[PDB]
Design an enzyme around this catalytic site. Structure first.
Site, PDB file in Angstrom:
ATOM      1  CG  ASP A 132     -10.388  -0.105 -17.643  1.00  0.00           C
ATOM      2  OD1 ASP A 132     -11.607   0.016 -17.352  1.00  0.00           O
ATOM      3  OD2 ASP A 132     -10.010  -0.278 -18.816  1.00  0.00           O
ATOM      4  CG  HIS A 157       8.446  -3.990 -26.878  1.00  0.00           C
ATOM      5  ND1 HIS A 157       7.160  -4.470 -26.968  1.00  0.00           N
ATOM      6  CD2 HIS A 157       8.334  -2.780 -26.304  1.00  0.00           C
ATOM      7  CE1 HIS A 157       6.298  -3.585 -26.494  1.00  0.00           C
ATOM      8  NE2 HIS A 157       6.993  -2.540 -26.090  1.00  0.00           N
ATOM      9  CG  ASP A 165       5.326  -7.086 -27.615  1.00  0.00           C
ATOM     10  OD1 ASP A 165       6.403  -6.747 -28.172  1.00  0.00           O
ATOM     11  OD2 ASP A 165       4.752  -6.386 -26.735  1.00  0.00           O
ATOM     12  CG  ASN A 177       4.451   4.905 -24.041  1.00  0.00           C
ATOM     13  OD1 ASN A 177       3.797   4.517 -23.078  1.00  0.00           O
ATOM     14  ND2 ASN A 177       5.323   4.122 -24.657  1.00  0.00           N
ATOM     15  CB  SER A 215       5.141  -1.474 -23.578  1.00  0.00           C
ATOM     16  OG  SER A 215       4.729  -1.162 -24.892  1.00  0.00           O
ATOM     17  CB  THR A 230      -0.912   0.031   1.207  1.00  0.00           C
ATOM     18  OG1 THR A 230      -0.097   0.033   2.379  1.00  0.00           O
ATOM     19  CG2 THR A 230      -1.937  -1.130   1.229  1.00  0.00           C
TER      20      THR A 230
END
Ligand code: MG
Ligand code: NA
Ligand code: NA
Length: 279
Positions: A200, A69, A39, A161, A224, A16
């Site tokens: 979200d 990536h 990907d 981004n 990403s 937390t």
């Protein structure tokens, strides 16, 4: 279970408060779940995957990850040292080329592929797809993400981004999937992270250490890198029976750390993925 000296993002999703370094998690660790990483591919031979990764589809000449990536994102989902869900099964779908780029028609095809291929696989705790990709707004890309979710897969996608509203990006702007923004180790919205009503959840996205090609590791930043934290968390929570593919995004938002991020614009959720693990 506890992993000492974990990457900050793993510690963060089990605390937390920011600034800790131990990742606390239930030992089940996503066993019995499956995560498709859509990907540049996955270097499945990397020792960090422990034989739990395999390529299942490529849209290019080779299934190899010639970029890194996809391997990095897969590592945040499920590698031993760098992963949220350390015992999940990883499936690679190479829709992006070795420069990290891909056409929307190919990305769409790879989503459709996952929706079908999951029927060849034994994933008793459920199926997740992690999409650390996207471009400008496309109804067709959003529809493909929506179909994949409707087919029974927990879809997590990068917010992007652009330091902009994600409404103008896809698949970020598809409402029915789980759109993931990025945070930093001091609980600021990452400087590059998109924002907006369609987000979200946030996950760790700045300076994230994970696997790389050539059997290596590196730290990089992006939405990403935040996306696979959420995809891995969903797999973990599904293995525990706490949620389902259809409800996992909502559950993660329900159970998130709330109000702890800075530079969140009014109208964007202030929610940071949290496993609420209590030994
Ligand atoms: Mg959504
Ligand atoms: Na991903
Ligand atoms: Na804020």
């Amino acid at each position: 279970a506890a992993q000492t000296n974990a990457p900050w993002g793993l510690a963060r999703i089990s605390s937390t408060s920011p600034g800790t370094s131990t990742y606390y998690y239930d030992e089940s660790a996503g066993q019995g779940s499956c995560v498709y990483v859509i990907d540049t591919g996955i270097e499945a031979s990397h020792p960090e995957f422990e034989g739990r990764a395999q390529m299942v589809k490529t849209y290019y000449y080779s299934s190899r990850d010639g970029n890194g990536h996809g391997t990095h994102c897969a590592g945040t989902v499920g590698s031993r040292t760098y992963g949220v869900a350390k015992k999940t099964q990883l499936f690679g779908v190479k829709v992006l080329d070795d420069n990290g780029s891909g056409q929307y028609s190919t990305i769409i095809a790879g989503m459709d592929f996952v929706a079908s291929d999951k029927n060849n696989r034994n994933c008793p705790k459920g199926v997740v797809a992690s999409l650390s990709l996207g471009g400008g707004y496309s109804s067709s890309v959003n529809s493909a993400a929506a179909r994949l979710q409707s087919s029974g897969v927990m879809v997590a996608v990068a917010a992007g981004n652009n330091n902009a509203d994600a409404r103008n990006y896809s698949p970020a702007s598809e409402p029915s999937v789980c759109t993931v923004g990025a945070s930093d180790r001091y609980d600021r919205r990452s400087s590059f992270s998109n924002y907006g009503s369609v987000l979200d959840i946030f996950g760790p996205g700045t300076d994230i250490l994970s696997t790389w090609i050539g059997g290596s590791t590196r730290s990089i930043s992006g939405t990403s890198m935040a996306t696979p934290h959420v995809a891995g968390l969903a797999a973990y929570l599904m293995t525990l029976g706490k949620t389902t593919a259809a409800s996992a995004c909502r559950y993660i938002a329900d159970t998130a750390n709330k109000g702890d991020l800075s530079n969140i614009p009014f109208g964007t959720v202030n929610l940071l993925a949290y496993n609420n693990y209590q030994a």
